[PDB]
Design a binder for this molecule. Sequence first.
Ligand SMILES: CCNc1nc(NC(C)C)nc(SC)n1
Ligand SMILES: [Zn+2]
Ligand SMILES: [Zn+2]
Lengths: 453, 453
Amino acid sequence: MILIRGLTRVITFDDQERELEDADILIDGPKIVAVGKDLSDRSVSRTIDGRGMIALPGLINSHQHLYEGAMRAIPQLERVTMASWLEGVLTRSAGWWRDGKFGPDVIREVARAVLLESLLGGITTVADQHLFFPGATADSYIDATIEAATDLGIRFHAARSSMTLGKSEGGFCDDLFVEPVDRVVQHCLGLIDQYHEPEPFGMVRIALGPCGVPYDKPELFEAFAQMAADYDVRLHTHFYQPLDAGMSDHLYGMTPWRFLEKHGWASDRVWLAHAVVPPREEIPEFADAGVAIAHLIAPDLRMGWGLAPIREYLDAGITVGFGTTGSASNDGGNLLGDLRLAALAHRPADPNEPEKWLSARELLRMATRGSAECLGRPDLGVLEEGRAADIACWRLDGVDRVGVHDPAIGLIMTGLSDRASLVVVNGQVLVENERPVLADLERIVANTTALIP
Amino acid sequence: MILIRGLTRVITFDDQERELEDADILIDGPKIVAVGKDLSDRSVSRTIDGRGMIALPGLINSHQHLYEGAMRAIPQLERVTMASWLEGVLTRSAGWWRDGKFGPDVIREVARAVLLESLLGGITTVADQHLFFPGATADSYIDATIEAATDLGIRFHAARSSMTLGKSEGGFCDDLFVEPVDRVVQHCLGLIDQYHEPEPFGMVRIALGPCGVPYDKPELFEAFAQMAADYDVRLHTHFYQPLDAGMSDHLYGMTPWRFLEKHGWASDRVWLAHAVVPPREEIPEFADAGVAIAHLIAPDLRMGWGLAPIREYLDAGITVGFGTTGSASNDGGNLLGDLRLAALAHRPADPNEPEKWLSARELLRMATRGSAECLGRPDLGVLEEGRAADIACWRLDGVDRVGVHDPAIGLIMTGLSDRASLVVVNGQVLVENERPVLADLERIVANTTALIP
Ligand SMILES: CCNc1nc(NC(C)C)nc(SC)n1
Ligand SMILES: [Zn+2]
Ligand SMILES: [Zn+2]
C-alpha cells in the first residue's frame, strides 16, 4: 500500500464536491482505499510527502489525435481556415507516408512523446482517435499507439476511426483512406478481442469512432451502434463543427443530429467532440438522449470557430468533458493550460452576466469527472474509496503562486508552468518531483526527434 | 565579456527581422557587441552553451500592478464585472492597510516575488503602475518596488499613479484614496530627482501615470504634460476600457481621446493601456499623434471586455506592445503565456480572414520591441550591436516540444512550461537552468508568503 500524506488541498469531485485540507490519500493496488485526515500508515509500504501540493483526480483527455504530434508549429498551417488546414495535414501525412517516413514505427514514437508529455501535464487517461489509415488496409497504427501507452503506464482509450464515405460517391473523403464498412467493423472486432479490458480499472479500452457525419456511411454508424450494444463499448465522433450542418443536409437533407439519431447514435453510449454550433432547439434532445460532449477550446479558437455553448449544455444537465485535440491544431497536449483558455475566452460572450462564466471548479470537473463520464468510466475522475488510484498533484509553493488565496482557482489562473509534481496511474507512481519515474525522457526525446519528418 | 555560443535559433527583431541558426551573442558590460555565427572569444571571460535554446530580446511587460500579487485567486473576485471587481480590490487593500498588514514593507516583498516570477518567465523589464497611497502623506510604496527591482537586478519603470477625482465630484472612488493634485505632482518631482536614470542602459526610470480619465482631474493631466516636457520622462494611463466613454461624456462631454488631446496627452511621450473599445474614427488620430498602445489580452478577457482592435492599430502604424496587468486581474505575471491567449482569442473575430489573425512573430515582437517602444527605450527589445544585453532563452529539446517545426511559433503554441532557461539583464546573468543565480528562490517565497494578508 501507498500513502500520500498531508496534501495541502484535495479536490475529490465526489457527489458532495468535498474538498479537504491537510489530508491524505491511501492506495492499495489500482484502487483508492481512503481519502481523509490522519489516515493510518498501517500496512503502508511507502509514504509520499504531499505537503505543499494540491491533488486532483488524474486529468482525462477525452479527445486526441496522437499522430499529429509530428505536425506542430508548421508555419504554413499557423493561420489557416479549416479547409486549408485539413488540406494541408492530409497532404503532408500522405506524402510522408508514401515516402516511407510515416509508418506505424514512427507513429509509435510520436505517440510515446505526446503521451509522456500528457503524464507530465497531469493527464492520467487519454482517448486517441487515430485518423490516418492510408491504403485500403489500416496498418498496425492503433497497435502502435496502444504499445506506446502500455510501455508508459498511461490509461488509454483507442477510438478506431475511419472514412468510409469516399468522394467517389458523394463523399468528401479521398479514396486513399476509404475502407469498406465490413473491413472497418472487422478490424474493430479484432481490436476488441486482442486489446479490450472491460473489467473495472482496465488499462486499455476500445471505442468506435467514425470521423463524422460528413465522412462516414449511415451503415457504419448503425454497424457501430450494434457493436456498442454487443460489447458494451462506447461511440465517439466529431459533432457540429462549422459547415457540418451544410454537408449533412446536402447528403441526407437533415441535421447532423437528426442523422445520428436516425442511425442509432442518440444514446447514453455516445460522446461527441466540439459541438460548436448546434441548433439551440436540438440541445434539449441531447439532454434526453443522454449523450456526452467534449469541449475543445483550443482547436475551436485556433480554427476561428468560436465558443461552444457550454453553459447551455450544463444548464440542460448534459455531461461535459474536456480535450485538447491533436497537436496539429493546438499545438500542445497541455490539458491544464487549455482550461485557462476556456476560463477566459468564454467571458466576453456574456459581458454583463458573470454568473454564466465557467468557473475554475467547473472546468476542473470537466477535465476529470466530466471526461471520465464521456468515456464511460465510473471508476475514474473522482478521489474516493473504490475508484482508481489515478491521481495528479501540483506544487503550490512556487514563487509564481505566492499570494494565491484559492488553490483550485490558482491552478487555472496563475503559474509559469503546468508541470505536475506527482502523477499516479492505476496505483503506479509515474511522475514524482516533476520527473518521470520509469520513462527515459532524454532517450525518448532523441529517438522521437530523429523520426519526425 | 560573455559569449553565448551555438544558440539553435536567435530572433533579433532588428530592422530586417533577421533570425539566425546555430549562432552566438557576444556581451560586453551592459551592451550587446555582436550577434552572428562563430563569434570570436578573443576577450571573453565566460562562455555559455546555447545549444538547444532559442534566444529573444528580454520580454518587456509594459503594464503591471505589482501589489496585486497579494490578491490572486480570490474566490469572491473570480467571476465579477469591473464595478464589483474594483470595489473588491480597493476595499481589501484599504482594509488590510488600516490593519497594518499592507504597508510598504509588505508591498516590497510582494513586488520581489512577482518581479522574480517575471525574470523566471523571461521578462527583463517591467513597468509598474502603483496607485495605492492611502493616508495623509504619500508613503514609500514606489521606493519599495524600486528597492525590490534593484535587489533582483531587473530593469524597472515606475509610473507613479493616483486617483485625484473624488466620488464627491464624479469619481468612481472613495476619498480614502484621493490625493490633492499638488501632493501627487510634488511626489513625482522627488521621485524623478531621486531615482530616474535617463542615460542609455538606465536601470530605473520614472513615468507619470494617472489611473485614467474617469479617475483623475484634468489638472493632473496638464501638470504631467508639463513635467514630462521639462524632465523628459514618459506619460502612461488606462485607455478606452468599456464604460470610460460614458463616464468621460458625463463629466466632460467629450471622448476619452478628445480629453487627452485637450490636456496635452496626444503626443509621442504617451503609452496607453488596454485600448479595448475606441471609436474607429479615432484610430488614425492615435497614429498621427504617435501614442503607443499596450495590449493586455488577459484582463480584457477576464473582465468580459473582448478583443482590442490590434490588427487595426498595426495597419495604422501605431506602436503596439504587450503586458499582463496586475495579478488581481490575470492572475499571473506570465507574459509569454498570455501571448498564446492573444494568438488564439483574436481568431474568432475574423473567422474567414486568417491573414488578420496575429502571428506568433507579431506577438513576440509586441512583447519585446513593441513594449520597448511603449516605454521609450531604443536601447531595448532588439538583439543587435549597441543595444542592451537583455536576453531571454528557452530550451527547445524538452519532450513537450518534439515535433515543433518552427521554434518561434513553438514557443507560443506548445509546451507545459513557460519557464525561461537563461536570462540576462544589463549584461548580468540572473537566471540559468531555470533558476535564479543570485536570488534565494526558496527564501523569497518563504518570506513573502508570511506577509500575504
Ligand atoms: C481603474 C482603471 N482600471 C484598472 N485598474 C486595475 N488596477 C488597479 C486598481 C491597481 N486593473 C485593471 S484590469 C482591467 N483595470
Ligand atoms: Zn478531432
Ligand atoms: Zn492597469
